[PDB]
């Protein structure tokens, strides 16, 4: 959209250094490189059984169209080539005249053709999600030249999106046993991760990935990102006012006043109050009873949400048999049940008085979330009683090997002959969610391909919005 960052990365050198040397290492009369992008393995995260296609549109627009147009094709040819040549002389000591860079510049666009799975659709592990190839014989080198830029910018949004989807899967499973409806699920995983992401750019694409399965986020720039590259008719994401530790302790030690003060500031909004700044169980067992009348007086769409931020994840929410105190043996959810109202649903699980709520957002991971819900189900509490603030220990603590993303070349054309290069071999076609076929030539029939032409020769050929992406994911279930 209408803002801008100053950049240093040279468009024609947006790669691993060694890719500059590959053009002349290729056989003579090389014409076409065909490559595949694949989530090859989930042994490091077996709960990720579906890979959610997400991020391509943003990547195409930001880098392949805008970054190259703004900083390469728009600039003067002589300056761009002289910079490339000069770099290769200082760093490495060889004469590269950059004549291939100039030829590309004269072309005016990337002779690149990309097919990808529609965003919001999902595929099994080991199924290709993207293919790329060059469309002009002189630029065989360009396909793999772009390998570095492709997955430095795409593996994170898909891993985030696929993690979000797996969370929702677990949350729906629990709602089917403990809850009469699933109205709470779009809000049950709230993105907390921004401050712990490795950079703002990683915060936008990972946050955007979370928004494909959930409405709750604290990463405002992820909202702005989804709006700039995808768009939707309704609100992209939602959030609530919430206190932080500095706010609580700046009000001193009488937290009974601070609770009351903060609740007056947000009379008609949902409001989270971090409650462990001084003495958590004092807040829960002493001040919450004193506030009960004021709590239940607030409108239902303005519930007070209690946020612990310390102690063992399971014991705080579900309780510790190892005692000393019953409040510690019962845990937060049972304590709120004792204090405030509640009902029992058709499925037979306790639902807390909807005037009070609870959020745990302290290093939340998938197995911690799962254990907590298993804990609550065992005590007879509906899974809708807890919200999870999901942070960097979920969305930052990944690598390209979480789902095993690799962009590997699988077919080459030399002197008019196409040969498979060595998983997959040759050109690929995706038949369903969990099956694909390879060993294909460019003459074969791709009519029934799930991979959809996306970008070719500088043009975005097919555009989606975030409403379509989210609908595609509903159907995926």
Ligand X SMILES: NC(=O)c1cccnc1
Q: Restricting to residues 102-131, which ones interact with a copy of itself according to CB under 8 A?
A: none
Instruction: Spell out, one character per residue from 220 to 259, where the chain touches ligand X: x when CB under 6 A holds, - when not.
Output: -------------------xx-x-----------------
Query: In degrees rounded to 5, what are phi and psi of residue 186?
Result: -60, -15
Q: Which of residues 218 and 449 has its CB atom nearest to a copy of itself in the complex? A: 218
465 binds a copy of itself, rule: CB under 8 A: no
- Overall size of the chain counted in residues: 477
Angle at 197 between CA 152 and CA 8, to 5 degrees: 50
Instruction: Spell out, one character per residue from 161 to 190, where the chain touches ligand X: x when CB under 6 A holds, - when not.
Output: --------------------------x--x
Tokens 């040759």 belong to: 426
Which residues 18-47 are close enough to bind ligand X by CB under 6 A?
18
117 binds ligand X, rule: CB under 6 A: no
Closest CA to 39 of 132, 145, 155: 155
DSSP type of residue 209: H
CB of 249 to a copy of itself, least distance (A): 4
Residue 370: Cβ within 10 Å count = 16
Q: Which stretch binds a copy of itself (CB under 8 A): 119-127, 173-181, 394-402, 454-462?
A: 394-402
CB of 377 to a copy of itself, least distance (A): 28
Number of shown-chain residues binding a copy of itself (CB under 8 A): 117
- CA–CA gap between residue 209 and residue 156 (Å, rounded): 8
Rg (CA), the chain: 26
Closest CA to 87 of 23, 156, 13, 148: 13
Q: Which of residues 27 and 108 has its CB atom nearest to a copy of itself in the complex? A: 27
Angle at 95 between CA 94 and CA 96, to 5 degrees: 110
Tokens 């999870």 belong to: 388
Instruction: Spell out, one character per residue from 330 to 359, where the chain touches ligand X: x when CB under 6 A holds, - when not.
Output: ---------------------------x-x
- CA–CA gap between residue 178 and residue 115 (Å, rounded): 42
CB of 271 to ligand X, least distance (A): 9
Which residues sit at the interface with ligand X, rule CB under 6 A?
A: 16, 18, 187, 190, 192, 216, 218, 239-240, 242, 272, 305, 307, 357, 359, 361, 387, 389
């Amino acid at each position: 959209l209408n803002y801008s960052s100053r950049a240093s990365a040279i468009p024609s050198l947006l790669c691993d250094f060694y890719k500059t040397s590959h053009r002349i290492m290729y056989p003579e009369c090389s014409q076409i490189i065909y490559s595949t992008f694949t989530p090859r393995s989930n042994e490091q995260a077996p709960y990720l059984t579906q890979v959610v296609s997400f991020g391509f549109q943003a990547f195409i627009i930001k880098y392949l169209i805008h970054y190259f147009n703004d900083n390469f094709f728009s600039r003067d040819k002589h300056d761009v080539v002289t910079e490339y040549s000069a770099f290769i002389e200082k760093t490495l000591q060889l004469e590269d005249t950059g004549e291939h860079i100039a030829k590309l510049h004269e072309l005016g666009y990337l002779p690149i053709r990309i097919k990808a799975i529609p965003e919001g659709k999902t595929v099994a592990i080991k199924v290709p999600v993207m293919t790329i190839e060059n469309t002009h014989s002189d630029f065989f080198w360009l396909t793999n030249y772009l390998e570095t830029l492709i997955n430095v910018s795409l593996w994170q949004p898909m891993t985030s999106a696929s993690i979000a989807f797996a969370y929702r899967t677990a949350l729906i499973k629990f709602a089917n046993e403990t809850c009469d409806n699933q109205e709470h699920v779009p809000f049950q995983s709230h993105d907390f991760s921004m401050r712990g992401m490795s950079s703002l750019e990683s915060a936008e694409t990972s946050g955007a990935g979370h928004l494909t399965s959930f409405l709750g986020t604290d990463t405002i720039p992820a909202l702005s990102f989804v709006e700039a590259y995808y768009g939707s008719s309704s609100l992209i994401g939602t959030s609530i006012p919430a206190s932080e530790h500095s706010v609580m302790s700046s009000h001193g030690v009488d937290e009974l006043s601070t609770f009351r003060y903060l609740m007056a500031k947000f009379p008609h909004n949902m409001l989270s109050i971090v409650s462990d700044t001084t003495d958590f169980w004092h807040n829960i067992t002493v001040n919450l009873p004193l506030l009960k009348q004021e709590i239940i007086a607030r409108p239902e769409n303005a519930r007070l949400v209690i946020r612990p931020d310390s102690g063992n994840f399971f014991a705080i929410i579900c309780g510790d048999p190892t005692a000393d105190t019953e409040h510690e043996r019962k845990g937060l959810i049972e304590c709120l049940w004792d204090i405030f109202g509640g009902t029992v649903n058709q499925k037979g699980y306790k639902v807390i008085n909807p005037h009070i709520g609870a959020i745990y957002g302290d290093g939340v991971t998938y197995e911690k979330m799962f254990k907590i819900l298993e804990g609550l189900q065992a005590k007879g509490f509906a899974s809708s009683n807890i919200v999870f603030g999901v942070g960097a220990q979920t969305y930052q603590r990944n690598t390209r090997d979480t789902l095993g993303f690799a962009l590997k070349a699988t077919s080459i054309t030399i002197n008019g002959e196409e040969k498979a290069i060595f998983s997959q071999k040759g050109r690929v076609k995706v038949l369903s969610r969990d099956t694909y076929v390879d060993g294909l030539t460019s003459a074969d029939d791709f009519s029934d391909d799930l991979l959809e032409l996306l970008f070719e020769d500088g043009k975005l050929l097919r555009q989606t919005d975030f409403d379509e992406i989210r609908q595609n994911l509903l159907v995926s279930r």
